[PDB]
A paper describes a structure:
ChtII is a GH18 chitinase and possesses the greatest number of catalytic domains and chitin-binding domains in this family. Here we report the catalytic properties and the crystal structures of the catalytic domains of OfChtII, the ChtII derived from the Asian corn borer O. furnacalis. Analyzing the domain structure of the predicted protein with the SMART tool revealed that OfChtII contains five GH18 domains and seven CBM14-type chitin-binding modules (CBMs). The other two GH18 domains (C1 and C2) are predicted to be catalytically active (CAD).
OfChtII-C2 was also crystallized, and its crystal structure was resolved at a resolution of 1.95 Å. The P21 asymmetric unit comprised two molecules of OfChtII-C2 (which overlapped with an r.m.s. deviation of 0.24 Å over all atoms). OfChtII-C2 showed 60% sequence identity with OfChtII-C1. The overall architecture of OfChtII-C2 was very similar to that of OfChtII-C1, especially for the conserved (β/α)8 barrel domain (residues 2059–2301 and residues 2377–2426), corresponding to an r.m.s. deviation of 0.63 Å for 358 equivalent Cα atoms. However, subtle differences between OfChtII-C1 and OfChtII-C2 were observed. The entrance of the substrate-binding cleft in OfChtII-C2 was more open than that in OfChtII-C1.
Numbering used by the authors:
A (entry chain A), B (entry chain B): 2056 to 2438
Write the structure that this text describes.
Amino acid sequence: ERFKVVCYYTNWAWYRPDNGKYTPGDINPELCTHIIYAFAVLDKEELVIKSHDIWLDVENKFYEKVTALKSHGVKVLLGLGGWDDSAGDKYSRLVNNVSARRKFVVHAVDFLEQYGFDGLDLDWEYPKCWQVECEKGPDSDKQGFADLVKELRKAFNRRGMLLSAAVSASKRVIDYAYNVPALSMNLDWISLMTYDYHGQWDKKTGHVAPMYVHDKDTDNTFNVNFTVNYWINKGADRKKLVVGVPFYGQSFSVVEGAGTGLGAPTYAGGEAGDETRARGFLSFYEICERVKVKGWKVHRDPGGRIGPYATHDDQWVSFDDDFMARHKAEYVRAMELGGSMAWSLDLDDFTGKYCGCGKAPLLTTINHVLRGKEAPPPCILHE
Amino acid sequence: ERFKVVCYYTNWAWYRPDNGKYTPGDINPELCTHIIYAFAVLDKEELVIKSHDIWLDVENKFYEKVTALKSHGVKVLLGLGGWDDSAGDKYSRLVNNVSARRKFVVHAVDFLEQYGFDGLDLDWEYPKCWQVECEKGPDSDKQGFADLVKELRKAFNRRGMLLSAAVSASKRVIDYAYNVPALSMNLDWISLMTYDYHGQWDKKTGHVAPMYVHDKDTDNTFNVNFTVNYWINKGADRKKLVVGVPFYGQSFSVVEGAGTGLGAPTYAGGEAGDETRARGFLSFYEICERVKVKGWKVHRDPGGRIGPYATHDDQWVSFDDDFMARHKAEYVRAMELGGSMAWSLDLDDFTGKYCGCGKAPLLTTINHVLRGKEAPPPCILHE
Ligand SMILES: *[C@@H]1O[C@H](CO)[C@@H](O[C@@H]2O[C@H](CO)[C@@H](O[C@H]3O[C@H](CO)[C@@H](O)[C@H](O[C@H]4O[C@H](CO)[C@@H](O)[C@H](O)[C@@H]4O[C@H]4O[C@H](CO)[C@@H](O)[C@H](O)[C@@H]4O[C@H]4O[C@H](CO)[C@@H](O)[C@H](O)[C@@H]4O)[C@@H]3O)[C@H](O)[C@H]2NC(C)=O)[C@H](O)[C@H]1NC(C)=O
Ligand SMILES: *[C@@H]1O[C@H](CO)[C@@H](O[C@@H]2O[C@H](CO)[C@@H](O[C@H]3O[C@H](CO)[C@@H](O)[C@H](O[C@H]4O[C@H](CO)[C@@H](O)[C@H](O)[C@@H]4O[C@H]4O[C@H](CO)[C@@H](O)[C@H](O)[C@@H]4O[C@H]4O[C@H](CO)[C@@H](O)[C@H](O)[C@@H]4O)[C@@H]3O)[C@H](O)[C@H]2NC(C)=O)[C@H](O)[C@H]1NC(C)=O
């Protein structure tokens, strides 16, 4: 239990064409120390946890089917929030009202125990910077969020439950949102969302999760290494920091004649994948199909500062492969951090059918480094 | 029937939470003469129609569930394109290549018959002006699109299938994009997208779909009455023209101290609604909740040139209500046009729960005028 492997399971992965469909039965519990059930949501009116999908989570028992995996020795927490649920002021209204926080904490304990959860993972995106609009929220969101965490910490300790949070990798947002010393002390781990540094919103190609500074960078804080050191320098316990790894790529459509390099101007997200059906986004296995079957070209950084990207016509997608997933896990071990986090189980090649690298190659690579699981070498996409 | 009521059904309304969820079972076929399934997409590599959501459209048979409604005496067409599929050059590569057009047409007939579709609705936004960027596309997009339409017409007539298109209401785009006489002759109807004349991109408040010239207008072509007469003057058969009506509002966040009037400076789109969850956009039923429950104030034009708008704090949304929907249908009858188009079914108060005016009040009002369906009177939002 020296290093954690925190696995995000997403309930909406069931609503996917059969080859992409991911159910509780697809979880390999040997590959996780902790599983986060993403996502529950905050009721706008009552400001308490509620299921976002009663039909799957409750009627079809997906909550209980995932928490049942604790018989395998994994801890199973409920994730609250996410990007989509963080629109608007409801989380700000919760944390800035003392009586609302108290109602939330009491209800949360009962909700979690009702379904067998070992605790709660907070994924408010973000305190003050609601959906990264920092002018939107009050400055008091930072202190209100810290107070919610402290009060959840005290109530959870009476129950032996775990409390974690997924947090921003943006220096700007971190400065606005987080009392870093208080969060480090009161959380069992801090999952750094060290991805989505770049995407089609930049209007030019960029890597979803740069590891180190690149010479083409315009901001030297948009990389995992800065993010981790910034949290440490802000007062975070290194063992509390869990470094997220994206199991998906950010895709782009490149302006005609702009080339295939980093920073090339773009006009849209990439064409949607068959399984994930979201322009701007491709699962790792959809990227494998493009490289293996559709002839997309893989571009690598000889300096090892960013992971690969793949191209075809004006399409362009950046992503982490086996080698960068391995490096980031080895970075976690070298830096003596708390572990690695996976976003998300269902976007890995969990069936093994797309990449030819065995089942769940990205997650297996992380477990190899952090937990000593014997494993095959990293697979070369291009091969 | 003398007048058509062309209903857009948007499949990814299925993913909306709570009462915003809209399924094929929510379609009332008696309120439509033609149903368009929005949307399929153009495969970038093969340049043929493909499903945009295999899981809903094919695995769960939503295509066939909607085309099965033709037993009610309605025609069901597949819509291709839409705004999001119209970025980049893929439609331009199709229409400017003779062999690609032939492959597309042959495949399209088989694709439509496979799922029981009665025909195809083309929603390329837009020939030449790709996503209204007129510098991007070649002048030859106009002629290529007309040739595609002509060739689809020939093949569809062998099968008794219908062919339609949704087209721009912008004079500039119309001049660049459409061989109006050829389209009028070869299409079973032309759906004028007579909405989105104004929105947050203007950086000031304006009505989503002005009917007539208003004194605050800076451009006297940005209204439905001009668009319709412009298509007629360009050579369109009046019978072929179908006037679109928006079932949603364009929302704005207004500069502090700028007031609530038309043309007031804005700094962002409006806050997203609970169910449609898109900044700058609110469904009619979301607008009803705001007026009925949240105390938003309704502002009307005594001159009848634009529909209402609603305000609360710095929020501002313009929309068509029952009275303007009725007027636009009565305009269709007075002008002896082809009918009205509804964009889209799922944004109406289709459950009847938000406005208290019965199920699908906007669509019922249009059917009342154009098809003589008995109906309740228009509901006054303010009551
Ligand atoms: C992630 O983010 C971090 C925070 O932003 C980055 O942290 C920075 O990392 C560098 C380390 O590379 C560190 O820089 C200094 O570290 C100590 C200061 O305490 C210095 O000794 C270092 O000086 C060495 O390197 C200099 C090169 O710039 C050189 O000028 C200097 O003379 C000395 O050279 C030795 O080391 C080199 C590298 O091994 C050799 O090439 C060179 O020949 C010298 O080697 C000899 O001496 C060594 C002992 O000094 C010995 O080991 C060797 O065998 C041989 O005998 C250096 O300037 C920053 O301070 C640090 N910043 C913070 C805030 O921590 C981090 O880089 C980033 N990671 C990545 C991958 O980007
Ligand atoms: C949608 O977009 C279109 C753009 O193409 C706009 O089209 C324009 O529509 C106007 C009408 O709104 C049309 O105007 C002329 O139509 C004919 C000319 O052929 C005339 O009959 C009209 O003249 C009458 O109105 C004049 C305007 O005030 C007036 O000066 C004139 O003396 C005459 O007045 C009579 O009619 C008025 C309206 O009923 C009365 O107020 C007035 O007292 C007079 O009524 C008497 O006479 C009537 C018989 O003429 C009789 O019925 C009545 O009982 C009484 O005894 C008019 O000028 C434009 O030609 C046309 N433009 C184009 C380019 O096509 C359209 O307006 C727009 N819609 C909206 C809502 O904006």
